[PDB]
Design a protein around this ligand. Structure first.
Ligand code: FMN
Ligand code: 4EG
Ligand code: CL
Length: 397
């Protein structure tokens, strides 16, 4: 059914519906599909779902000129640990991704692959089964007691990466980016948010290292910036974006409770602008808003009111995608898009509304989402949410 009590607003008269260029892509509107893990990939081999993934992305590409960022895709087996999330390291994976990218392009939309590395969020038992390490920045602080226990039980204790192992990940990022472009993607997004491996290096709670990769703002940012630089070299700055969540607490990150958190992220933005001014500007910076510090809490919950991402705009001068509880808040979007380099990512409601862009333009009711099927091995709750037309025919009004 439709979300009850929601009072839609037509946003067609705002900059949300003004075209903008991101990297090589001429977007026709500024409603972006942010990366959304759905867990339909099949085991073994982390293969994008052979039955439904093309349809899922085709549905959500239906509005011409939409920028789509894929679900997180593992750069290598060592980077993974969830059996049903896809990878981008193998030929068998790329066969399916190619079909997906082709379908999106047939609909005249665009696709950016999010490159994912789990670190301490991985399942240590899956990794042990596959002969792989359980990795993080440090080895003396853990995501939670359950993860620490699972690792010990699996004889796969959390391991602090060596410098050589960091270089190996960088090699894998480079190859994953190359694979993505070769299969037809428009670009990649480096995931450095939501408490996954790169975020584990950025955050002083999870990073207690005393080598060059920890112990200061510059050191904590080193790994993320090395990945940025490696990918810019490999496939070009116009095909690379970076995602950050300064105020996130998901996966045991610090958020605003850490008084140095804004400085840490301001440093990263500054280093990106420095590179931009020296001729290599990333396609975009993608920020998760303090509106959503944990995306598995219902909209309105876990909202941090003691911080703003506005600081980034004083530093980074390129496009900024902002995501977090915007679908139910057109009044906030109306104000944010007055800034002419701001795009809006809509996550959970793009899960439930394949024609979300039409609904935003025209001020239509939104399909409620079913959180139970966010992660599920099913077409149900994946490719069977109706368009507005289909919803009316089903009597949802
Ligand atoms: C089911 C689900 C899966 C997600 N998967 C990813 C992901 O793979 N990579 C990522 O950076 N963010 C991921 N996110 C976070 C979203 O991109 C987004 O930032 C968040 O849901 C807040 O936006 P929203 O309120 O519009 O949903 C996910 C969120 C949800 C609910
Ligand atoms: C492969 O990439 C992932 O598995 C990504 C997530 C999971 N699980 C993820 C990333 C950010 C926010 C929520 C889930
Ligand atoms: Cl601003």
């Amino acid at each position: 059914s439709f979300v009850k009590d929601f009072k839609p607003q037509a946003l067609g008269d705002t900059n949300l519906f003004k075209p903008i260029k991101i990297g090589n892509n001429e977007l026709l509107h500024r409603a972006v599909i942010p990366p959304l893990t759905r867990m339909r990939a099949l085991h073994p081999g982390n293969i994008p779902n052979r039955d439904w993934a093309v349809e899922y992305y085709t549905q959500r590409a239906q509005r011409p000129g939409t920028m789509i960022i894929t679900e997180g895709a593992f750069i290598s087996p060592q980077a993974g640990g969830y059996d049903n999330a896809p990878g981008v390291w193998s030929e068998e994976q790329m066969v399916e991704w190619t079909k997906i990218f082709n379908a999106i392009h047939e609909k005249k939309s665009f696709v950016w692959v999010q490159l994912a590395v789990l670190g301490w969020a991985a399942f240590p038992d899956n990794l042990a089964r596959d002969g792989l390490r359980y990795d993080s920045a440090s080895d003396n602080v853990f995501m939670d007691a359950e993860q620490e226990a699972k690792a010990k039980k699996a004889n796969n204790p959390q391991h602090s990466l060596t410098k050589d192992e960091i270089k190996q990940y960088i090699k894998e990022y480079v190859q994953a980016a190359k694979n993505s472009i070769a299969a037809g993607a428009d670009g990649v997004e480096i995931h450095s948010a939501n408490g996954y491996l790169l975020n584990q290096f950025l955050d002083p709670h999870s990073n207690t290292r005393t080598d060059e990769y920890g112990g200061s703002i510059e050191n904590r940012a080193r790994f993320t910036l090395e990945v940025v630089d490696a990918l810019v070299e490999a496939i070009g700055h116009e095909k690379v974006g970076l995602r950050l969540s300064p105020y996130g607490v998901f996966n045991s990150m610090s958020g605003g409770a850490e008084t140095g958190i804004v400085a840490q992220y301001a440093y990263v933005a500054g280093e990106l602008e420095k590179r931009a001014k020296a001729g290599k500007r990333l396609a975009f910076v993608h920020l998760v808003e303090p509106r959503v510090t944990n995306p598995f809490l219902t909209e309105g919950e876990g909202e941090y009111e003691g911080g703003s991402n506005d600081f980034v705009y004083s530093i980074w001068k390129g496009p900024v995608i902002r995501a977090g509880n915007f679908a139910l808040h057109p009044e906030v979007v109306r104000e944010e898009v007055k800034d002419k380099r701001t795009l809006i990512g809509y996550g959970r409601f793009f899960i439930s509304n394949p024609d979300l862009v039409d609904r935003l333009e025209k001020g239509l009711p939104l399909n409620k989402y079913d959180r139970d099927t966010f992660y599920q091995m099913s077409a149900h709750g994946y490719i069977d949410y109706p368009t507005y037309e289909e919803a009316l025919k089903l009597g949802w009004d």
